[PDB]
Amino acid sequence: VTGSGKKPWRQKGTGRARSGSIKSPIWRSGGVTFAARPQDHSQKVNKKMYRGALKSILSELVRQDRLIVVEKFSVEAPKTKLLAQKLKDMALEDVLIITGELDENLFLAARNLHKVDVRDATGIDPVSLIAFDKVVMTADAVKQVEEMLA
Amino acid sequence: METIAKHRHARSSAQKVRLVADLIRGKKVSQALDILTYTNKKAAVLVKKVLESAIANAEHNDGADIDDLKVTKIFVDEGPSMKRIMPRAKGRADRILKRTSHITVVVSDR
């Protein structure tokens, strides 16, 4: 805290409480006994725990029928209207499209819309899986995920 | 009928103007006017000006016939205080409070 180490007043004789510096935590404009520091909140999670959680969430999705497996899912052109129609006809609004191979058309179509997101099989997170109500899977993506899980 | 009148930021202190206000509290307009006129206080004229303002407001902005008018509600209140520093002995510094008071006069026929 910017200031001076000089005592506000002499230690004895004054009719005021003992003080050592204006920077004391019990003084206005300066203090904080325990100031926060830049710290890393990253938590160490074992690969086994991560795999187990991913398998458990996938099993829960399958049991609740929120996971859907389909054939090649692609959009002919990078137009959001085509993706919107292809989702509305199939009756899906909040769904995650996981594809074995990322396609620029689908990526551009889904980038703007928030209810629909696109991620690769390798790039999957339990937080996203739980957040998304529905999940649509391609055959190649399912095979890759199963191979990775082992 | 309210016909209120007040003089905010008055120099006179509320503690010293309440004494004058009590004399006219609940008396007829003419009696209060003469009492304030012949009272030996600065607050006397200070509140006589407010009473004149109130009676003029009653005459113009409200009903005429000031004869049947009484000062029903009158009260003196403190106002913002100004801080002044007065040097004292031994280098000690004290603070002088220049007190101001708000005076309100309400006159009604009934």
Partner: peptide
């Protein structure tokens, strides 16, 4: 609204020895 900077030293205590 500055706090009094200078305060005089206390009057010496009466001899209580």
């Amino acid at each position: 609204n500055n706090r009094p900077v200078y305060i005089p030293r206390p009057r010496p205590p009466h001899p209580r020895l």
